[PDB]
Design an enzyme around this catalytic site. Structure first.
Site, PDB file in Angstrom:
ATOM      1  N   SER A  42       0.817  -1.218   0.000  1.00  0.00           N
ATOM      2  CA  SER A  42       0.000   0.000   0.000  1.00  0.00           C
ATOM      3  C   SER A  42       0.863   1.287   0.000  1.00  0.00           C
ATOM      4  O   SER A  42       1.474   1.663  -0.997  1.00  0.00           O
ATOM      5  CB  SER A  42      -0.951  -0.149   1.175  1.00  0.00           C
ATOM      6  OG  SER A  42      -1.993   0.766   0.999  1.00  0.00           O
ATOM      7  N   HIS A  61      -7.836  -5.321  -0.591  1.00  0.00           N
ATOM      8  CA  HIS A  61      -6.715  -4.600  -0.036  1.00  0.00           C
ATOM      9  C   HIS A  61      -6.411  -5.046   1.384  1.00  0.00           C
ATOM     10  O   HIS A  61      -7.304  -5.318   2.173  1.00  0.00           O
ATOM     11  CB  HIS A  61      -7.086  -3.114   0.010  1.00  0.00           C
ATOM     12  CG  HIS A  61      -5.931  -2.206   0.341  1.00  0.00           C
ATOM     13  ND1 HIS A  61      -5.126  -1.698  -0.673  1.00  0.00           N
ATOM     14  CD2 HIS A  61      -5.405  -1.776   1.540  1.00  0.00           C
ATOM     15  CE1 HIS A  61      -4.151  -0.958  -0.110  1.00  0.00           C
ATOM     16  NE2 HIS A  61      -4.281  -1.038   1.230  1.00  0.00           N
ATOM     17  N   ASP A  66     -10.091  -3.818  -4.732  1.00  0.00           N
ATOM     18  CA  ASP A  66      -9.369  -2.805  -3.998  1.00  0.00           C
ATOM     19  C   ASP A  66      -9.616  -1.550  -4.802  1.00  0.00           C
ATOM     20  O   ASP A  66      -9.405  -1.545  -6.032  1.00  0.00           O
ATOM     21  CB  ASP A  66      -7.887  -3.190  -3.876  1.00  0.00           C
ATOM     22  CG  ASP A  66      -6.930  -2.131  -3.313  1.00  0.00           C
ATOM     23  OD1 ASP A  66      -7.434  -1.036  -2.950  1.00  0.00           O
ATOM     24  OD2 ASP A  66      -5.659  -2.420  -3.169  1.00  0.00           O
TER      25      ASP A  66
END
Lengths: 309, 309
Positions: free
Chosen positions: A154, A276, A246
């Site tokens: 991320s 995610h 995501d």
């Protein structure tokens, strides 16, 4: 509707039923605690590993804490992975991603160094990229290795890419031989079909992305915040994975496509039917273990090809 | 200047000094003989392989000759590779690509079936893609296997993609589980920087390409001639390799990018410093051997992951 693995739907139903404030309603201290407790309940443990060592290294704004994971400390000089945790530049630490790091060290059979970089809002942009780049240069100089493999999830996927670009321009004592951005943020803008489709109900929400982005306070024009806006030529061989549910999926795809268009050897993987954040949810989402393992097996081969040539 | 491997440079020096007419000054029969003799001088021999079987299969227009290669004929039912040779839809046959197919069968440890599809100008577009699709359906229905891996180089890379799109829309008796287009043609237009950069002196020339194009006489709006203009969603996991000094490099990049943007898991490899046609030049360009082996090792892993379901 959208393809969703049955174990992911089961974990989502659990997440949707929890009482008590959303992360975005919390000060950073309380958000940081939410993530630790979620990890305790929905991540696997560290498991068995020959060596884990903490130390401080010098960096430009003070000491940076690192953690070295090695399941075979008698190795010869070979590649080392530097890992940058996610948490939207606000949350996360060495403990939230510990079970992943250990697993990586075991599957890849290389040392893994996790960086405890400075967090917002106490240290807003560009503290995180400054720390990550300084740590990675320190590793190339001070740790026995032949080359660096950079990885992160991320926000940490962002830091992977931005750090690979800074070393491409001004090399460390050892080259980066590969990079592994996991569900990365590569831009600050939200004009993406995946963002319209998945911005609610899928762990990473519109609300939480706004919250992260306001505290980090990134300069949207700077390559360290928005690397999709800058040339990608001469980056190393990249394994980029996204999760199909995501909100960041489409900017991940777009970055992988930009890499191919610049001639960078690229492997794109999409974890179909998952969300995610899955690399820290391998007990709440058991299928996450096969996504982790499947990506790191491909990475291990990418690194073996780079070292055999 | 552009990066060129020293042994590729050396091969090109030899090729550019050859006397006697260019391929494009020849009728098809004479071009077909030039390719056989080039392979004789610059390709490795078949080498050792447990089983090679030739037969005819019924096709839409008559017999289609095929060749089955197996280095382990005792095996249980597993994946089978169907291979479509290159040669601009005009030249090539089972003998021109024989050393590659044997090498694939050895490295992949699966049966390889090469298809001798109809050639232009005796049989213009769409004869080749019809034959390839017919032969691939025959294989799925008649050879013991669990799945199909389609592969091919240049024109044959085009045929791999076209064939996969046809089977995505109406499946054969067995799923396509992976596709391996090698320096593919995916369009008929020439508006590419690689075409301007590498259209002379690098074996595949502007003059050759026009000559192939005129004989094949493809309809530029048909999906079977120009797959880059049509949706790529739902194709299988793709390994797409290009050569960096190839006139077709940029359209190959652009196709790999479009696959990623449609969510297809994709590995893009680029043979840096080498030319179009290298899979048939592994004696005159010894570094081609590592390009072949490198790609097929990656493909083998892709297939292993699919068949561990």
């Amino acid at each position: 509707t959208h393809y969703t693995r049955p174990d992911v739907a089961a974990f989502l139903a659990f997440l949707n039923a929890q009482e008590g404030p959303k992360m975005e309603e919390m000060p950073p201290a309380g958000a940081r605690e939410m993530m630790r407790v979620m990890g305790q309940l929905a991540d696997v443990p560290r498991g068995e590993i020959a060596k884990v060592e903490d130390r401080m290294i010098p960096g430009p704004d003070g000491d940076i804490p690192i953690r070295l994971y090695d399941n075979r400390p008698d190795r010869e000089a070979g590649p080392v992975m530097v890992f940058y945790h996610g948490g939207g530049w606000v949350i996360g630490d060495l403990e939230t991603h510990d079970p992943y790091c250990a697993e990586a060290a075991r599957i890849l059979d290389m040392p893994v160094i996790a960086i405890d970089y400075r967090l917002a809002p106490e240290h807003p942009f560009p503290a995180a990229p400054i720390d990550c780049e300084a740590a990675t240069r320190w590793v190339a100089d001070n740790i026995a290795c032949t080359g660096l493999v950079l990885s992160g999830d991320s926000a940490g996927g962002n830091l992977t890419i931005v750090t690979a670009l800074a070393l491409r321009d001004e090399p460390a004592a050892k080259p980066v031989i590969a990079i592994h951005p996991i569900y990365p943020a590569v831009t600050t803008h939200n004009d993406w079909q995946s963002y319209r489709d998945f911005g609610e109900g899928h762990l990473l929400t519109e609300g939480s992305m706004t919250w992260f982005g306001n505290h980090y306070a990134a300069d949207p024009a700077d390559r360290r915040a928005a690397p999709i806006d800058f040339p990608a030529d001469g980056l190393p061989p990249t394994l980029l994975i996204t999760a199909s549910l995501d909100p960041l999926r489409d900017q991940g795809r777009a970055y992988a496509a930009k890499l191919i268009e610049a001639g960078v050897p690229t492997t794109y993987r999409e974890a179909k039917g998952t969300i995610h954040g899955y690399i820290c949810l391998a007990q709440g989402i058991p299928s996450a273990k096969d996504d982790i393992r499947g990506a790191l097996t491909v990475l291990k081969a990418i690194v073996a090809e780079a070292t055999g040539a």
